[PDB]
Amino acid sequence: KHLTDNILQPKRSSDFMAFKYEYSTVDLYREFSESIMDKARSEVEILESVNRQGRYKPNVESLKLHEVPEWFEDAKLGIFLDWGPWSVPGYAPLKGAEASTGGSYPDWYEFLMDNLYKEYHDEVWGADFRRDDFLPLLTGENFNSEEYMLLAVNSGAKYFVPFTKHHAGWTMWESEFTKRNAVEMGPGRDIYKELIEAGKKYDMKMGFYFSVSEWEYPVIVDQNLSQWDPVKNLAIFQDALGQIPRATPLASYFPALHDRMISGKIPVKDYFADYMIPSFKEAVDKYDPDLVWYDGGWGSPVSISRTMETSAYFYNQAEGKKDVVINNRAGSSLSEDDLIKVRDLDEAMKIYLSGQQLGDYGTPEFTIGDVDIQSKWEVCRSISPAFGYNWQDDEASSLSGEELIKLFVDIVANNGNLLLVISPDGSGKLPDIQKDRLLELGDWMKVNAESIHNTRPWKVQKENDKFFTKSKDGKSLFVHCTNWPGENLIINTPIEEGIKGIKLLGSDINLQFTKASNGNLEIPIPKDFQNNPSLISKYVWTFKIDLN
Amino acid sequence: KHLTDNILQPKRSSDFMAFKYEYSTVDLYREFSESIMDKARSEVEILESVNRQGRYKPNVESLKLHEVPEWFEDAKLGIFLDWGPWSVPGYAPLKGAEASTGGSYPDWYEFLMDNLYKEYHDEVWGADFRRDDFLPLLTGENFNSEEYMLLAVNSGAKYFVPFTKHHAGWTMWESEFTKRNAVEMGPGRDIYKELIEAGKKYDMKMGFYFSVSEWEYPVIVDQNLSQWDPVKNLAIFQDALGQIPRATPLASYFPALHDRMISGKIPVKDYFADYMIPSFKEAVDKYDPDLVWYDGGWGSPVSISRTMETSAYFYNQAEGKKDVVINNRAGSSLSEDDLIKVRDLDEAMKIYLSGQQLGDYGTPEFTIGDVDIQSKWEVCRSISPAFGYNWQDDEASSLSGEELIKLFVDIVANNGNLLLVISPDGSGKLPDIQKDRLLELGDWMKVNAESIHNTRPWKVQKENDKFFTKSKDGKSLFVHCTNWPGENLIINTPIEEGIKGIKLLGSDINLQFTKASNGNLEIPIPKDFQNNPSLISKYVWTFKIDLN
Ligand SMILES: OC[C@@H]1O[C@H](O)[C@@H](O)[C@H](O)[C@H]1O
Ligand SMILES: OC[C@@H]1O[C@H](O)[C@@H](O)[C@H](O)[C@H]1O
Ligand code: NA
Ligand code: NA
């Protein structure tokens, strides 16, 4: 049904033995909780003092004054490295398990293996194979951080966002606040450090992806939750992150159920104050990222998660040092009363959107939808529906290079950035098909990058098969033709300014042009270009019009 | 840790294969839901019409006027047959997993196998072995209903209460409202019908044990609960029954998780109206029980569960036909406001008890506690802490026959009934240790039953090692000596009435007496009784004093 004999399908090893980390959850409680909470209190005091003295305060109106940096307007393309324990099984259904975004989520395997993907998991991995048994298999033996950064550079990308910490809480960086980190578990390396160092060497802006909430977190409680609870003073914190109905805010903690899904996480009293805030601060302080990509901010509203404090801190510590940016996923600004009204209730969506007030730019996922092209936005997606590696993904399931380039041009014409997801396997190897699409995009950008990087939308974004961008200064208009226009390029959209010159990017030759009497621009195409226009540029041909 | 090589420990068979019931939950939705809801609506209408026309109305004040039947005052001993799918694994910890009652619960295994007992389950049965894989192993090959009824008769019991439907919803009777029944799953017989027929044959009062709520139940919903839900219009209803925090009222339904926990259950729109009420009515109508033993009434308050309607119906359908009784487990009469106050908040216990207003008699579980001996009460317990079969139970864990008989006499002198739990294994065989205790109790009752059945508390319940009962007609006082009194029985407690005669039950000798000057009754005991009084009666010696 789900178990194939296809070599490409990751599956249970014949030598599988349970991963029992050196420290049980109770061991971490006894040995590390007090120490961590002590350290957290000191770090939170420092962060709060920085915010009290700093330009940015933890409130919507203060943070709103922060502006999108020039570099982020100009970047247009980022690489989103979706790699983590979920990369080992590398599975979602090719069809039929799409979320409301239209994507599919191999990167939700650690959660969905217990419900939506349980039949697959039980047949391919085994019911006795727990979430944390994927951690030792995340070897990174084929993961080369410099090669990933160079691939991103060569693709034309201007920022690189690793999945530094996703919903199950494994950190790509060596954290003092969790043993569920890349040094203790999986590759045995500070993967984030390697990527940060590579990004500095290649002059690449670096992101920090950070799940605000986690699916489960062991917490210290005064009173137990039921007569069945086996362990005094420990429970499991759960919020809305999982999306499915669950016990909230606390579930009863049972070692035989929970320990092998939360290996390495040190119990604390207050998930947000004692763990989330100090771990965020730690990564910002150590790695100095250019960009914060919150995720999982729907778990708890910001009145509880305190992400306005992490946002203010990030901006404050950047002052005078570098220009930085935050996405719009910190969480909701709504009051308890407004959150209740939404749950009770089109009318629910209007109230919800009113509470989405934090961040520098919008983050449509997979489907672009009805974007406001007057504000900055970024669409995230891979070359397929899949966020995270899908061993089944292939030529049939993935965009062609041609489709990817045309989609990219569309995005950029409409004021968007593309944050292009790449998804390695458990070894850290990138599938050849994803490598190929990056190479093809890179080859196209070699010719056409000046019509993409550092541009802005024009008064018109699309005309038939043409997409427009303009130089920052207004003096160059770029016409991206998604069909080879043949003998003649005709542009119907009025161009008020006089024209100094027109050229096809990829040719050093200046093109002929005249204005017809109906208003159209007519651009004859050299006979020598017709024989094989793909030699100049594949898929999309860009004409630069220099204005007076 | 948990898997022994003890043959007595039930464990995974080498020939185990998954039980995938011929009707999936979705099959039952498509094929049976409409039919069941059609029948339910008609049955609820009939039940409501009976209550409108009947003497008892579904409100606290009306139901309170119903009185404990003479037969229940007189019975003193019932047998509580704790048999179900949980009987197969037959496990709870010998120590350390007691609930707040002081008992332990092998009969919660179907629920606790996923949390508290998960380490045991994984080691002994396997992670791939689901709750419903116990159902085919509940063979009943050693279960003879006539033999169980005769065991009850011969023990001195006057009522027999089978676990007709416990918290996972397997019915001992052949129900039209569920395929999770004893005919379609497990023994392939209407076990309840067999027991009811035996009870009629042997003139035994018959109970109907009924879990109001169930741990999980598939329900039909207009809107799905999450973007992850695989099946339109089905979800899982959950209330407070499970005691541990859970999603309530609804969890997302996932076939690969839920189907092998809820085999046989037919989805309905309203758990209470479309399933609970008509299934209750069905069993009452078909089997004509003398007693309703509600359980699991803490799931939902009676405003939602509607158990005042089932209680009124039970009384109304019996009126003019037979005298019947209900325990006190229908559920809470508290308002939503009062239930909220209890959750917020010793103070919580006072409010909770104020909302416990339904039923004919109290049901202390395991621990008797501070019972009101002016009202009728019944303590339920097995010979050990274990409710349900525990394969580990032995001489060290169980009451001796001696202890059982003395506890029983204590209960009866204090106006209680003992509802003695007996716990068979998966085959339906009763463990030898429980058989031994029942033999001792039965042998004791053969001699002493007239001092137990049809008696009432006396003006004094206990004098040193002596417990008193009196015949309901006042003409006999029974003195139960828990120590052999030796050469003389001396009774300090004044007996105002003249004495016609005195006898030790088990002997035909009339005993002489004198009243001393201090007031004491002095009863010389025959020399021939002194060497071996245990021949006459074991453990407790009962003297019958006939009064004027
Ligand atoms: O594009 C980022 C995606 O964002 C979602 O919010 C997460 O829940 C997914 O796992 C991640 O892949
Ligand atoms: O006295 C009956 C016991 O009553 C409890 O309420 C149930 O939850 C137990 O399973 C059962 O053994
Ligand atoms: Na702003
Ligand atoms: Na009453």
Chain A contact present for B246, CB below 8 A: yes
Chain A contact present for B7, CB below 8 A: no
Ligand 1: residue of A82, A91, A104, A107 to mutate (most ligand atoms within 8 A of CB) is A107
Task: Report the SS3 class of residue A77.
Answer: strand
C-alpha A537: how far from chain center: 29
Pocket of ligand 1 (CB under 6 A): A 82, 105, 107-108, 295, 365, 380, 387
Chain B contact present for A115, CB below 8 A: yes
For residue A12, with 0-12 CB atoms within 10 Å meaning exposed, 13-18 middle and 19 or more buried, which class applies? middle
Cα(B360) to ligand 4 centroid in Å equals 5
CB contact under 8 A, A244 and B228: yes
CA atoms within 13 A on the CB side of A526: 12
- Nearest ligand to residue B311 Cα: 4
Domain edges within chain A:
25-447, 458-547
Instruction: Report d(CA A401, CA A444) in Å as an integer.
Output: 10
Query: Which technique?
Result: X-ray
Chain breaks in chain A (C to N over 2.5 A) after: 345
CB contact under 8 A, B226 and A247: no
Whether residue A249 has a cis bond before it, omega within 30° of 0: yes
The set of residues, in sequence order, having a beta carbon less than 8 Å from that of A481 and lying 6+ positions away, is A465, A466, A489, A540, A541, A542, A543
Among B114, B227, B244, the residue with its CB nearest the CB of A225 is: B244
Closest CA to B425 of B159, B90, B170: B90
CB A132 within 8 A of CB A179: no
Bridging pattern class, strands A462-463 and A466-471: antiparallel
CB B92 within 8 A of CB B105: yes
Between the alpha carbon of residue B170 and those of residues A228, A415, B85, B134, B211, the distances in Å are 23, 61, 8, 11, 10
DSSP letters, A441-497, are HHHHHHHHGGGTTTEE--S--EETTEEEEEETTSSEEEEEESS--TTEEEE-S---S
Ligand 2 within 6 A of B378 CB?
no
CB A117 within 8 A of CB A109: yes
The set of residues, in sequence order, having a beta carbon less than 8 Å from that of A2 and lying 6+ positions away, is A119, A120, A123, A124
**Chain B residue closest to A126 (CA)?**
B128
Instruction: Report d(CA B193, CA B175) in Å as an integer.
Output: 11
DSSP 8-state code for residue A518: T
> Whose alpha carbon is nearest atom 12 of ligand 2?
B387
Its CATH class, for the domain covering A458-547, is mainly beta
Instruction: Report d(CA B148, CA B428) in Å as an integer.
Output: 10
- Nearest ligand to residue A382 Cα: 1
Instruction: Report d(CA A260, CA B421) in Å as an integer.
Output: 38
Whether residue B424 has a cis bond before it, omega within 30° of 0: no
Query: Could you identify the atom of ligand 1 that is nearest to the CA of residue A365?
Result: 1
CB A454 within 8 A of CB A442: no
- Residue A190 corresponds to which amino acid? D
State in Å, rounded, how far the first CA of chain A is from the last one: 66
DSSP letters, B346-392, are -HHHHHHHHT----SSB--BS---S--TTS-EEEEE-SSSBSS--TT
Ligand 2 within 6 A of B271 CB?
no
Cα(B96) to ligand 4 centroid in Å equals 38
The full 3-state SS of B31-93, as one line of letters, equals HCHHHHHHHHHHHHHHHHHHHHHCCCCCCHHHHHCCCCCHHHHHHCEEEEECCCHHHCCCCCC
List CB contacts (< 8 A) between B114 and chain A: 257
**Chain A residue closest to B236 (CA)?**
A245
Number of residues that this document lists for chain A: 548
List CB contacts (< 8 A) between B99 and chain A: 227-228
Instruction: Report d(CA A367, CA B205) in Å as an integer.
Output: 68
Query: Could you identify the atom of ligand 2 that is nearest to the CA of residue B381?
Result: 1
State in Å, rounded, how far the first CA of chain B is from the last one: 66
Task: Report the SS3 class of residue A181.
Answer: strand
Which helix H or strand E contains A514, and what residues bound it? strand A514-515
Interface of A with B in 118-157 (CB under 8 A): 118-119, 122, 126-128
Task: Report the SS3 class of residue B140.
Answer: coil
Task: Report the SS3 class of residue B412.
Answer: helix
Task: Report the SS3 class of residue B15.
Answer: coil
Ligand 2 within 6 A of B387 CB?
yes
Query: Could you identify the atom of ligand 2 that is nearest to the CA of residue B366?
Result: 1
Chain A contact present for B221, CB below 8 A: no
Instruction: Report d(CA B206, CA B158) in Å as an integer.
Output: 9
Closest CA to B477 of B462, B456, B449, B447: B456
The set of residues, in sequence order, having a beta carbon less than 8 Å from that of A33 and lying 6+ positions away, is A220, A266, A267, A268
Closest Cα in chain A, distance from residue B218 (Å): 15
Query: Could you identify the atom of ligand 1 that is nearest to the CA of residue A296?
Result: 6
The set of residues, in sequence order, having a beta carbon less than 8 Å from that of A224 and lying 6+ positions away, is A232, A233, A235, A252
Plot region of B351 (φ>0 → left; ψ -120 to 50 → alpha; else → beta): alpha
Instruction: Report d(CA A212, CA A169) in Å as an integer.
Output: 10
Chain A contact present for B254, CB below 8 A: yes
Among A97, A226, A257, the residue with its CB nearest the CB of B118 is: A257
CB contact under 8 A, A228 and B244: yes
The set of residues, in sequence order, having a beta carbon less than 8 Å from that of A436 and lying 6+ positions away, is A401
Which helix H or strand E contains B278, and what residues bound it? helix B277-287
Chain A contact present for B116, CB below 8 A: yes
List CB contacts (< 8 A) between B12 and chain A: none
CB A391 within 8 A of CB A406: no
CB contact under 8 A, B245 and A228: no
Query: Could you identify the atom of ligand 2 that is nearest to the CA of residue B295?
Result: 6
Ligand 2: residue of B211, B295, B377 to mutate (most ligand atoms within 8 A of CB) is B295
CB contact under 8 A, A116 and B254: yes
- Nearest ligand to residue A360 Cα: 3
Chain A contact present for B298, CB below 8 A: no
Instruction: Report d(CA A497, CA A478) in Å as an integer.
Output: 14
Rg of chain A (C-alpha set): 25
**Chain A residue closest to B231 (CA)?**
A116
Task: Report the SS3 class of residue B345.
Answer: coil
| Structure token digits, residue B227 | 């973007």
DSSP 8-state code for residue A511: P
> Whose alpha carbon is nearest atom 12 of ligand 1?
A387
Which helix H or strand E contains A237, and what residues bound it? strand A234-237
Task: Report the SS3 class of residue A230.
Answer: coil
Which helix H or strand E contains A379, and what residues bound it? strand A377-381
For residue B98, with 0-12 CB atoms within 10 Å meaning exposed, 13-18 middle and 19 or more buried, which class applies? middle
- Nearest ligand to residue B227 Cα: 1
CATH topology assigned to domain B66-212+271-331+359-449 = TIM Barrel (3.20.20)
CB contact under 8 A, A230 and B116: yes
Chain B contact present for A335, CB below 8 A: no
CB B138 within 8 A of CB B110: no
CB contact under 8 A, A119 and B256: yes
Closest Cα in chain A, distance from residue B416 (Å): 27
The residues pairing with A104 across neighbouring beta strands, listed in sequence order, are A386
Among A116, A122, A127, the residue with its CB nearest the CB of B230 is: A116
Chain B contact present for A231, CB below 8 A: no
Among A97, A227, A256, the residue with its CB nearest the CB of B243 is: A227
Q: What is the CATH number of domain A25-447?
A: 3.20.20.80
| Structure token digits, residue A112 | 């969905």
Residue with tokens 């559920």: B331
Instruction: Report d(CA A210, CA A208) in Å as an integer.
Output: 6
Resolution limit in angstroms?
1.7
Among A97, A119, A254, the residue with its CB nearest the CB of B118 is: A254
Closest Cα in chain B, distance from residue A230 (Å): 7
CATH 3.40.1050.10, applies to B455-547: no
Q: What is the sign of the dihedral through the CA atoms of A246, A178, A15 and A106?
A: positive
Instruction: Report d(CA B175, CA B170) in Å as an integer.
Output: 10
Closest CA to B206 of B194, B218, B221, B214: B194
CB contact under 8 A, B114 and A257: yes
Query: Could you identify the atom of ligand 2 that is nearest to the CA of residue B108?
Result: 10
C-alpha A383: how far from chain center: 14
Closest Cα in chain B, distance from residue A2 (Å): 13
| Ramachandran angles phi, psi of B251, nearest 5° | -110, 150
CB A499 within 8 A of CB A513: yes
C-alpha B390: how far from chain center: 17
Chain B contact present for A39, CB below 8 A: no
> Whose alpha carbon is nearest atom 8 of ligand 1?
A296
